[PDB]
Every structure is written in structure tokens, then in C-alpha cells.
Amino acid sequence: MIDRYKHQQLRIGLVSPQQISAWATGEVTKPYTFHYKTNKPEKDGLFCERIFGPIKSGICACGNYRVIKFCEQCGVEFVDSRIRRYQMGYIKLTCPVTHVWYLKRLPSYIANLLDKPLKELEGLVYCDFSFARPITKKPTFLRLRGSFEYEIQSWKYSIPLFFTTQGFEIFRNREISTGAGAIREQLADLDLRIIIENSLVEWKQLGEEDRKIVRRKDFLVRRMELAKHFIRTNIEPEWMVLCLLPVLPPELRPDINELYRRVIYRNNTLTDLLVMCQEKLVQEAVDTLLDNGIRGQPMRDGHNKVYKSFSDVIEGKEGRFRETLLGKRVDYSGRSVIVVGPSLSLHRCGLPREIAIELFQTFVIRGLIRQHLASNIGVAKSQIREKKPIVWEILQEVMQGHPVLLNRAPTLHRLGIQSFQPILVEGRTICLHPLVCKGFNADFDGDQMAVHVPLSLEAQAEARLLMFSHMNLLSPAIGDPISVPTQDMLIGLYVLTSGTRRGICANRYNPCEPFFCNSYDAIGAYRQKRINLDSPLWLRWQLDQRVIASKEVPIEVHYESFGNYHEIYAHYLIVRSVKKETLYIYIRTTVGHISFYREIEEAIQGFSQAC
Amino acid sequence: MTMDIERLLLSEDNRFEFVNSVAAEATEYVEKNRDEYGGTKKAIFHVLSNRVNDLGFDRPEAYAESDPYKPGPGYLKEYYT
């Protein structure tokens, strides 16, 4: 067989400022969210209707309307408000800011690719440190190496005075620079192949010669591994420092808006100046927006409460991955307290009228309309709300053959959710079969269950042919039966099959019972109070010897001179003869063993006859 | 119908394929004759009965049965839990 090939993929990659612009194209320039009076989206703000899309689909910021492209006065599109959930914006940062994930997280990717200690980069980005010789692909004329913490006295007055201002600034950012701009310049002019070769040769030199002699090696292996991945992909190492800041769509942030304001609050302040301190404030605003809590003390709000960043909202047990994506709340679902029903079949459950009418509402509407008892959908829904007596006939009709899924709360294995055929029961409780309680680990002291309705034909087929209880009698753990009688049923069976009192518990003195043609006679005598449940009796047996008993020789053989002999065992009597081939069997038993055997036999025979 | 479902799976190498084929046949049934299903006749039950009948074993159509003892219109059986 040729496999039905399906080649589907998804990939993440570090994004480019050009791709950010293509997302937004659309720049958010003002930190205003809404008008204080009219509660309208402020233009160029975090909720700008021109940037992100029309609130109240098909209307402009002015108030015009068109049938569901751009307006002239306010320039708002004519589309659905769906776009406000997907359209991105961007913030044009005056200075580049590094991405916190790629600088502060350990081990730092920027530090390893640039090959400098992390404290040096942190001082360069946060403190007032200037880096010497940031780029190499352009010539220089100075002998400043490393990152001098102190400002160079000559570079402050002498060289700027000799080299004036315009040309000096023209060649300024080629020998000395500071902040994330220097880091981005270093990343942009990196030669990755040279990095790989230098790392390999240094690794060989170290090897040809014992803790940090190894840790330096692991850095070299890590760096050339990191350098290789940039060559074969389309990612650029300078994208780890951000030039633009994408903005979340407004409808996803109806806390986050506060952090977006601060970026605009401090970036628009910085562009007014154009100073070192304000550049750092913009960088910290982006870090708090992107990832709080990595920089030691996390920035708090006025209430001394830690802000929540995108990393916080995507990670953790309550994050997007583990709470919104791996589990969902669903429609066509109900819940109620479960009570025991011993008269139910193993494949049936009982549903309250309210839960059933809610879950099967659309099917009841179809049933109403189909037989001309409802003119339209609205009339049918009004009839359903009025609890008309004909709503329940249609509900009972449409529930036939449509399975439902029950589920108890702590689903520890797959038998924690099973499929049953719903029937309408009075009250407000879910009627549950007693033999399926062990699979659900359910008892009737306050437990509740959820109900789900498969809608499509494929789901109904799956529920009927895979999840019903009569095809799930074995547990997948070891293969043992899961629907075994327990407690009350087990006690009843034990009492039924506990035979006669024997020995000194039957007779007061040392002994120095009715005979029934068939089991029906014995059971009839029991019904007429002629015998007890455990009183001994002899039953004529006309089948093969199939009674479980100890493998023992007869207690006593009564051999007659005419040829017939009687063999007396502990639990049966066998009459044989030498003249004939006759062989009679009488079983010493009670009405209880007969009843158990007849129950199982009649179950088998009735199931066979019904098919 | 439980016995019939077990019988149909005795000739199926894969049960998931059986479920998919039954669902596809039921979908064809509903698409061809939409109005005949959803009430007393269910498409999946009709498919199961037809597959049982195709073996030569007589079954009521779609296992559709009613109560002959309903005391006229409007009366709904009250189940005894």
C-alpha cells in the first residue's frame, strides 16, 4: 500500500524590520487609547481606527457607513471588525533596542556570537559605557580596544574640537559607540565563516595541550554550532536587536496597553531631544513589555504589583499553550448530579429534560420545522421556550440513535469518558448505570458529570462504534475486566452461591432431601416456600458431568448382585450397570447454584434467540 | 444492534477504517435523501442494518421501532429509573 502522504509544516523564525513593516502596512505614534469624554479611538493611538481597522464594522471614525474601501477624511477602511483581531501595527524606535530574550537569558546568544563576557555587554547596554572599534568593514585610525568604562578625555573635547561637528559625527559611529546600536553594528558586520574557522582552530589548540580548560571548549563548540545555523537559514544575527516594535491588535488587548504607552511615552520623548538616560529608559520599557522578571527586580506598577509581559502570558500553566490551546470549553455541553439507575441497560444513560432540550436544541428545531409545526426558526425557538407538550415528543424522537459522551472530572484513563444512548428521565439528575461506576471512579455521594453531543456524522459514528461501554469491557492497563459486579451485587451472588450448612452445622447429632426431575421444579418449589435458598436437594442431571468438584473417588459404592451399582461422591450420585449402558446422574446442590447457572444460561440463550 | 456491530467487525482488519467507511456511507445516504433521516430513521443505523442485510440476515430497517401501546397522541412514556 502507498501511504496517503501529507506534508504539512510550521516554522518559527526571528523576524526582520522589513517584515514588521509589511505586517503593519500603519505606525502607532501617540500613547492615547481613547477619548476621555466620547470614548472614541484616538487617532494615531494604541486603538487608532485608521491603523487597525473599523470598530462597528462598516463605519468610519467620522460616522459614515457603507455596505460590507478607504475613507477620505479619516482614512478608515470599509471592512469587518474582524481585522481588528489580526491587523498589527509598529512603533518606530528612534534608537535600536536589543531583544531581552537574546541578551539577558542564560547563556546569552549575543554574548556568545560576539564572544564577550555577559557583564561587558550588560554594562554597554545599561550603564554609560562606550565600545571601541564597533565595526571592521570600515577603516579606522585609532588604537582604542575593548570597552573603556571611563570616557576618553581627548575624545570628549580635543578630537571633536579639531574635527569640528558635521564630519566628526559622520565618521563618529565607526570607532566609538555605545548601547544597543553598537551591538547591532557588531552583529551586522560579523563574518560567520571566519567565526567558525577561528572557533575550530582555537578548539584544536586547546585540545592538543581540568574544569575551565573544558568549559572554554564547550563555549567554542557552542559558538561554531550557533554560527553554522545562521549560514544555512535566512535569519540575520542583527535581528536580535530591534529597530521596530510590532504592536498587538487592539481586540486582543481590550496592562499590556500600559506597557505600550510607556514605550511611546519614552520614545517620543527621545525624538524630541534629537540623552543617554532616555535611550536606556526606552530599552527598559521594551524589556518590561517583552519579558519582565529576568533583570532581577521586575518593574511594578503604582500598586506595587509586577507587570505581566508577553512571555508571562505565553508561558506557565495558565499561559496560552497550556490553558487556551491544549484544552477548550465547548458548546452543546451540560452538567448535573449523577444518581444510580439499576434498571438501565449497560449502553444507556438518563438525561434531564432541561439538559437534553438545551443540548439537542437545534435538532428539536429541525424536528419542529420538518413536520410543519413551526413556521420558521424564531417561532420554533419561542415554542421551545414555552415548554409546549409537543416539544418533548420531538426531543424524544430526535434523541433516539444519537449518542452522548459522559465524563467525570478527574479523567485518569480513557474510560473516564464513555458514550451512552440517552433517554429522557424525570427530575434534574443524570441516571448512570451501576456497572460503569468503577471505570469513572464514581460514587453517588455528590459527584457530577459533563455531557457532550457529537454533531457531525463522523463524530456520531466514532462515539457509537468506539466509545460505547459494551465494547470496552477490558481495561487497557493489564487487560482485566472493568465492568465486574461489585459490593451489593457481589454480596448477593456470594449469598446465592453459598451452599448448604454441612457437618456439625447441619445436624446436632452424628447421623449414625427432595428429588427434583428438573431445575424448574426446584425453582417452583422454592417459589411456593417448600424449600429454602440453601436447603440441600438432589437434581436429576441429563447432560454431561460438568460440575466443578474435588477430584476424589466415590465415598461409598453400593454394588447390587443384579449388576447395578451406585457411586456416591461428595456432591453427586451416579447410577451405573453392567448389563446396560445406562448412566444416571443426580447433583446434590441448592436453589442458589441452580439459579445462578440458569441466570447465565438463560442470558446466553436469550441473546442468541434475539439475533 | 450491538451484536450486529460486533459481527460486522469480525470481517474488518482495521476498525478505524470500518468507522470511516460507515460514516462515508451515512453521509452519502443523507446527501441523496436528506428528508428521510434525522427523525425515526437515523442514517448510521440504516447503514448498519443494510450492511447486516447484505450478508443475508434480515433486520428491521435502521432498527426503527416504536411503542404500539402508546395511549394516543400527546402521551409520553415516563421512564422508571
Partner: peptide, 17 residues
């Protein structure tokens, strides 16, 4: 599970008679 393995001549030409 169920998702595994991706789930006119002879007309207008009769005998004139």
C-alpha cells in the same frame, strides 16, 4: 485512530422508417 493515514451519437441518427 480514525485520522491515521489521512482518514451524443446514436441520437438524431435513428432509423427514419
Amino acid at each position: 485512530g480514525t485520522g491515521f493515514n489521512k482518514g451524443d451519437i446514436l441520437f438524431y441518427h435513428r432509423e427514419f422508417c
